[PDB]
Design goal:
Chains A, B: Urokinase plasminogen activator surface receptor
Largest sheet of chain A: 8 strands, antiparallel
Largest interface: A-B, 95 and 98 residues
Entry title: Structure of dimeric uPAR
PDB class: cell invasion
Distance between the termini of chain A: 79 Å
Bound molecules: 2-acetamido-2-deoxy-beta-D-glucopyranose
Assembly: dimeric
Oligomer: homodimer
Shape of chain A: elongated
Radius of gyration of chain A: 25 Å
Number of strands of chain A: 13
Keywords: GPI-anchored protein, cell invasion
Order of helices and strands of chain A: EEEEEEEEHEEEEHE
Strand content of chain A: 35-45%
Amino acid sequence: SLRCMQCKTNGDCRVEECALGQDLCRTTIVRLWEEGEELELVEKSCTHSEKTNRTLSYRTGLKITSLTEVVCGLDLCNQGNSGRAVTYSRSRYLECISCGPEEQCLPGCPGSNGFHNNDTFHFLKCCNTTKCNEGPILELENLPQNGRQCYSCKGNSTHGCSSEETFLIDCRGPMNQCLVATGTQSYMVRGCATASMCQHAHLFSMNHIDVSCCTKSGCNHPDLD
Amino acid sequence: SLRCMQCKTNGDCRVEECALGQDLCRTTIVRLWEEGEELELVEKSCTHSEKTNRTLSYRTGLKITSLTEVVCGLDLCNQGNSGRAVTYSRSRYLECISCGCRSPEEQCLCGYLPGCPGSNGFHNNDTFHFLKCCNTTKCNEGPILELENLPQNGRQCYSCKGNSTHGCSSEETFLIDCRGPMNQCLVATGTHEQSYMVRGCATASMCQHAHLMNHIDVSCCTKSGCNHPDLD
Ligand SMILES: *[C@@H]1O[C@H](CO)[C@@H](O)[C@H](O)[C@H]1NC(C)=O
Ligand SMILES: *[C@@H]1O[C@H](CO)[C@@H](O)[C@H](O)[C@H]1NC(C)=O
Ligand SMILES: *[C@@H]1O[C@H](CO)[C@@H](O)[C@H](O)[C@H]1NC(C)=O
Ligand SMILES: *[C@@H]1O[C@H](CO)[C@@H](O)[C@H](O)[C@H]1NC(C)=O
Ligand SMILES: *[C@@H]1O[C@H](CO)[C@@H](O)[C@H](O)[C@H]1NC(C)=O
Ligand SMILES: *[C@@H]1O[C@H](CO)[C@@H](O)[C@H](O)[C@H]1NC(C)=O
């Protein structure tokens, strides 16, 4: 009876006897090139000569890339303040797509969104063209001054956003608009935004998010709401 | 000097004092939805507040997918049966592309001459090649279907591979029924690294501009069985 080598990189590799009706050994090679990169994967497994039917997935056309950065000056501040351990990666698959952050099955895309203040940065770009995908998303530390200045805070009207705590900051990159965002107990941020953000906002990450923008330096000052 | 968390997936995780002038701790979260799949990555590291330059890549626009599948029915035959070990995965990067004669590797500067956009299929009795070239995000989301998922399209071609004395003689040449869009009979004769020969079912694209065998010589016809040896 028929035994094949069962092996793929980062896997439990063994010789295995196959199930009945698995009559073929297989070597698979996937070579993939994009953006000057060449990936080459090999997988060896049993397999079958029978044709077997399989569903085809919903070709969405859209790839959504979302970035969030947080910075601080104090020691060890990027340590997580949880009791338990921190997530560093996560694969999530929506199995509806194989038949049988939005949940559509059976948005203000394409475009980019941007926001930042003195110590946090959120960028989101969704693309239906290949060039859009190949572009990298630049973090705060690589965006130059744009001549705009806006006010920055986050927190209650008494903790996080209060005359002491709100500072004027020099905007960077395409975030050449000033922004306020109101939401939820009451909670608020100020910072530089892209004009894109002011139309379709998506942030922390509160609800009943109320957003307004103005396009002159300093104009998101508190005594202007 | 300031000590921050340095940690990431498949990374060396620790607390480290940062280099001078790196006055900030950082936490970065990248969520990435694509083809019904949500991937998120977190990175904690040092960084700095002064803006510092970084170049962007030449965005090529193309994604070349390539599936290759080889089968046999004999015990332990997907053994690579060489003395030395075998490559399960390999990543290559062209450093030029970060702002630092090709086919199908690439030449950035013998440049931008594929004839690609589209797909190229070929199979024979026991091997299968398919080359999906992409220009839009929708052809990417199309998976490449293994031979076990292809119906028979009605065409029949002859099939061999190897020397004209060993592997591609009337003795070793068998008719096979093609599957999928591989509705053309093909012979190709190239070279290894003497003369090489291969016959199989291929696609019309495979016959126009496609490869993947040096000094490739390809000929295609579309009547079942017409890639028979004594027809060349
Ligand atoms: C899918 O598979 C079923 C049974 O396995 C078969 O009746 C049907 O015709 C197949 N459809 C296609 C398009 O191959
Ligand atoms: C992307 O979507 C827009 C609609 O907003 C459409 O006009 C355009 O043709 C699409 N591009 C691609 C490459 O699908
Ligand atoms: C908002 O106010 C309450 C009480 O006034 C306080 O306990 C809480 O910490 C404040 N919010 C933040 C984010 O500090
Ligand atoms: C990169 O830095 C150089 C000098 O270091 C500067 O002249 C240039 O303007 C910077 N890049 C851009 C795109 O401005
Ligand atoms: C793909 O490239 C071709 C040029 O060969 C062009 O006609 C087409 O619009 C491109 N599609 C996209 C989505 O860029
Ligand atoms: C045909 O090729 C084989 C290798 O597959 C080689 O060993 C053999 O000598 C060749 N036959 C000739 C040159 O007649």
